Ligand binder design. Structure first.
Ligand SMILES: CN(C)c1nc(N2CCCC2)nc2ccccc12
Ligand SMILES: [Cl-]
Length: 390
């Protein structure tokens, strides 16, 4: 650990639209806001006009451009981007102060990929080469940065949700957090770092062993928590959970928050819920705890999130006083996805060199006077490798 003072407060954005870092590409430098995505492995940037892009990468204006003369087709969940592969010199201004040659995918066509008014123009895929496209021989950005410079094979992410909804303009003002490249910044967390092993180097896959709602165990075969696979994914908004796990949690959260009642749509993430300015009854909503496999035999540790995390602020401007929120937990056929919602509670260390992911309580996590996110351990769990789906 130490102090990485230029890289602190370098991200902007929100859970609904993603978090981005300023990068430059080419000679002379072309500035672009790039989404930080731990759930993919391509460095891909808008390279042609699009209604939602205010600017883009212009290969014709860069002396250091080289065409790799291959195309790339990445289907997204719904829609796609299509790219022309190449290489160019790449920097991060509020970054490690080193320029590297990297594979860049010049996006030329795309559908349902860019977000309207998002203020990012590309994607920095930080995952491993195994899920890069067209295949693993395309070296990802981070692999290249390590090999070309002296930077340690490790990065860390502090995503900072504000307590309230942010406009298009306010996202640029409001600080969104920190990506630390090549290290761990001691001032971005309190208490201790607890590490879970990375199960496989493709996505950042982890093993969840136990789940609690206000200390109340969900009491399932822990294969159901990792049903298919569990991942840490900055490019996903919600905490996504498998079907059986999702329903059991919703029932448990409903019951704990029974002081009030909410429509069925709220629990399916569609309808807003709204209280008067400041009177959000956080105390009636329960904390959610995920136990992760520790790197010692028969040890787990616990990350605990608040309703401040799993209820995203979203404005309506129908009575502009009210504080409104959407339910930021949802169903998955992927297995568990620990999106921005979860990550906004914690400082997450991606220790690729030692094949593990660290968790600590974020200094910027949103909370009231009487509660706070936690990272706690150890806990003697038995048969934790049987929680893995294989
Ligand atoms: C930031 N997340 C939520 C993303 N949203 C969308 N939008 C969802 C509706 C249209 C596109 N596209 C992405 C593409 C890559 C990585 C993250 C995201
Ligand atoms: Cl989502």
């Amino acid at each position: 650990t130490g102090s990485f003072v230029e890289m602190v407060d370098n991200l902007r954005g929100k859970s609904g639209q993603g978090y981005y870092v300023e990068m430059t590409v080419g000679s002379p430098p072309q500035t672009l806001n790039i989404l930080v995505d731990t759930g993919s492995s391509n460095f891909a940037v808008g390279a042609a006009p699009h209604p939602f892009l205010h600017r883009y990468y212009q290969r014709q204006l860069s002396s250091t451009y080289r065409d790799l003369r291959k195309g790339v087709y990445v289907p997204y969940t719904q829609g796609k981007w299509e790219g022309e592969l190449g290489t160019d010199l790449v920097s991060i201004p509020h970054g490690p102060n080193v320029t590297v040659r990297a594979n860049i995918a010049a996006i030329t066509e795309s559908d349902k990929f860019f977000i309207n008014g998002s203020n990012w123009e590309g994607i920095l895929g930080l995952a491993y080469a195994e899920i890069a496209r067209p295949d693993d021989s395309l070296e990802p950005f981070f692999d290249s940065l390590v090999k070309q410079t002296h930077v340690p094979n490790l990065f860390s992410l502090q995503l900072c949700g504000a307590g309230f909804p942010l406009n298009q303009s306010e996202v640029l003002a409001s600080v969104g957090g920190s990506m630390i490249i090549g290290g761990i910044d001691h001032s971005l967390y309190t208490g201790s770092l607890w590490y879970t092993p990375i199960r496989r180097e493709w996505y950042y896959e982890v093993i969840i062993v136990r789940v609690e709602i206000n200390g109340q165990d969900l009491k399932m075969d822990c294969k159901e928590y990792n049903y298919d696979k569990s991942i840490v994914d900055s490019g996903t908004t919600n905490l996504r959970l498998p079907k059986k796990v999702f329903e059991a949690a919703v029932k448990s959260i409903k019951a704990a928050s029974s002081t009030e009642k909410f429509p069925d749509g709220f629990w399916l993430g569609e309808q807003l819920v709204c209280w008067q300015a400041g009177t959000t009854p956080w105390n009636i909503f329960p904390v959610i705890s995920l136990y992760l496999m520790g790197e010692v035999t028969n040890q787990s540790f616990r990350i605990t999130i608040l309703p401040q995390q799993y209820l995203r602020p979203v404005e309506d401007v129908a009575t502009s006083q009210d504080d409104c929120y959407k339910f930021a937990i949802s169903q998955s056929s992927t297995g568990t996805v620990m999106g921005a919602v979860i990550m906004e509670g914690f400082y997450v260390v991606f220790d690729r060199a030692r094949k593990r992911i660290g968790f600590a309580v974020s200094a910027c996590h949103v909370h009231d006077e009487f509660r706070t996110a936690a990272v706690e351990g150890p806990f003697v769990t038995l048969d934790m490798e049987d929680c893995g789906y294989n």
